[PDB]
Design a protein around this ligand. Structure first.
Ligand code: PLP
Ligand code: PLP
Lengths: 376, 376
């Protein structure tokens, strides 16, 4: 094995107690792909151009469905050539960014608590990952608290709103502040918008809808959660021309274009399923309302979720995230995601996925409320 | 842009004269995906597990279809966990290998003339690419002619039989020699078996069917050309456990598993289409026979193709590969692949794809034979 790869901690998500298992460690809604997307994929398989190698950077109709989506969704004007890069699932693009953008020894700020997969990308590019310390209840950056020396050396920053695992959301103004802090520096921003569709009390803002957003940032959007297409492996990067062009160049070397039929299904999804995205957000909103109501009534301490598909729950005293994870699976047959892999600041929380039977979730709630005595 | 990415020469394949255009610069057969593979993909889209995230390293049935294929095809016994890694199209896996296997400053031997895409992988891993000089008519390695100092420093070697662009084939014995040369050294081999199905006068051998093959090498196999599934993006690596495990680890960080429905279509292909692979080889065999007959009769100098889908044609005196490429498109409306991007040793050849209408190919032949006067 190479030294570079040896450095990389295993993908943390790469047995149960007596009770029937409830797996609340799941990303991703439980629902099927809308039938219309399925029907169009089925049809796209019979198309001669779809069976064969195509243009590396994607169909014109795909690039166009992307800019159209961003325009009517976020009033963001994008150029199809300069400001759009199709991704083979967003994980692939997110982990590619540092290789494309930074040089050995460059500092990269990573949200703590934040998403697990970024670290690998930084390490694959010989960068130096440094935590962006986010604090409850709202987990927003505090740029004045980042060491002045680190800010100066930072060439890339990941942001994630809605945040995985904390469910925290951003506003136009918090993006304004980030952009103003780093415009005219060599620091760029990657905003991971995987949960863009899931905004409970307010539609989540794009970083690119903030004035000057494209000057500092790209935004990465996934079809996985919004459209129940997680297994399909399709997303896109949008924004800063320089960053987009570097990604595009990287993908001409590591890939030979996206499956044409997958592109057509993606086009169909983006063009026709705005209402469904709304439906998805609403379904998780109430799922959240019911689950957090159960928790609050039994005085279990949690951080209220503002978007995404999870609740960020405190561990009780005398349990860390991994001890509480093992407790819940052993005693309660509830699988949760421990806060630890999400960063140091996740040490005393667990992540709970609401992406299961609107049924199951109720039994899981009653199971958890029984543990109220642990929090005294 | 990052320094690392800036180093990488553009993907060379990332206007016409008066005559109707014949594009002989194409990889990939012209035929459709067999209907049976299509039907099973269509059906696989409706399967709940296929629409969602699955196991990173692939379905058991896929791992099993791979080992079964290798067993009945090449009498090679493989372990499903230890010796099989599914690839998102082989290009992705081929370019990943150096990142997984070598360290900065390690030498990697690349076939000259050989495939275009390897160089990027080496450079992405900060390795030092060095040409493996192959000579006509047979383009086989001569290990005694590699500088003793280079061999000692080499940690990885790419081999490609059938070779792209030269169409050269290997034998069990040439693999025996390679394995004996590097067994017990820290040099590993990656054999690119993209044209495994296309063996004209003899079935192409696996490097893993040679005694001790798995001790030094992995072999990478693609469904693109064999099964007319080039746009689908599916292949696999097979062999050396250490190398396979490094690739598998790399793919847990850069990916989240292969589309389940794509896996099912791939399973179906591997399990049921041995005869079709034979058919494909035979179709290109005769296409080659007819085209090379035309060339030989008019005394146009070429290297006889033994496998793959191309003919490797000499440029006439006073034209290099790029000048001859421009000549053919301008004057003859024939697009060819210039030898140059395939290496220094391709400077005075062009690559001609037989992957077009069994019709077209005849007109392209007569167009080319008219140029016999240039070779005097
Ligand atoms: C889901 C997830 C991803 C990965 O999404 P894919 O497009 O399916 O690879 C990236 N970032 C966050 C925050 C996620 O939750
Ligand atoms: C076709 C080609 C590849 C790429 O194959 P994919 O699986 O479609 O990415 C790799 N090596 C050689 C020699 C090729 O001709």
């Amino acid at each position: 094995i190479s030294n570079k790869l040896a450095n990389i901690p295993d993908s943390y998500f790469g047995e149960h107690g007596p009770l029937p298992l409830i797996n609340m460690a799941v990303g991703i809604p439980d629902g099927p792909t809308p039938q219309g997307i399925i029907d169009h994929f089925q049809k796209a398989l019979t198309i001669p151009e779809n069976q064969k190698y195509g243009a590396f950077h994607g169909k014109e109709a795909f690039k166009q469905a992307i800019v159209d989506f961003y325009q009517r969704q976020y009033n963001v004007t994008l150029d199809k050539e300069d400001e759009v890069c199709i991704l083979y699932g967003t994980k692939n693009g997110l982990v590619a960014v540092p290789t494309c953008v930074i040089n050995p020894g460059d500092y990269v700020l990573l949200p703590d608590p934040g998403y697990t997969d970024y670290l690998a990308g930084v390490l694959l590019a010989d960068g130096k990952p440094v935590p962006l310390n986010l604090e409850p209840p709202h987990y927003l950056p505090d740029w004045s608290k980042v060491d002045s020396q680190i800010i100066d050396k930072t060439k890339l920053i990941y942001l994630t709103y809605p945040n995985n695992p904390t469910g925290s959301t951003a506003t136009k103004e918090v993006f304004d502040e980030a952009i103003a802090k780093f415009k005219g520096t060599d620091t760029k921003i990657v905003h991971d918008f995987a949960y863009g569709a899931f905004g409970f009390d307010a539609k989540n803002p794009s970083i690119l809808a903030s004035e000057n957003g494209k000057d500092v940032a790209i935004e990465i959007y996934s079809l996985s959660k919004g459209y129940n297409m997680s297994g399909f492996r399709v997303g896109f990067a949008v924004g800063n021309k320089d960053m987009i062009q570097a990604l595009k160049k990287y993908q001409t070397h590591t890939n030979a274009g996206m499956f044409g039929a997958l592109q057509d299904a993606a086009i169909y999804a983006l063009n026709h399923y705005d209402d469904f995205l709304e439906e998805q957000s609403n379904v998780f909103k109430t799922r959240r309302d019911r689950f957090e109501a159960m928790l609050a009534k039994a005085d279990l301490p949690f951080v209220h979720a503002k978007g995404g598909i999870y609740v960020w729950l405190e561990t009780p005293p005398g349990y860390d995230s991994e001890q509480f994870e093992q407790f819940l699976v052993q005693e309660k047959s509830i699988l949760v995601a421990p806060g630890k892999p999400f960063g140091e600041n996740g040490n005393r929380y667990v992540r709970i996925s609401l992406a299961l039977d609107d049924q199951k979730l109720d039994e899981a709630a009653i199971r958890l409320t029984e543990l109220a005595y642990l929090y005294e």
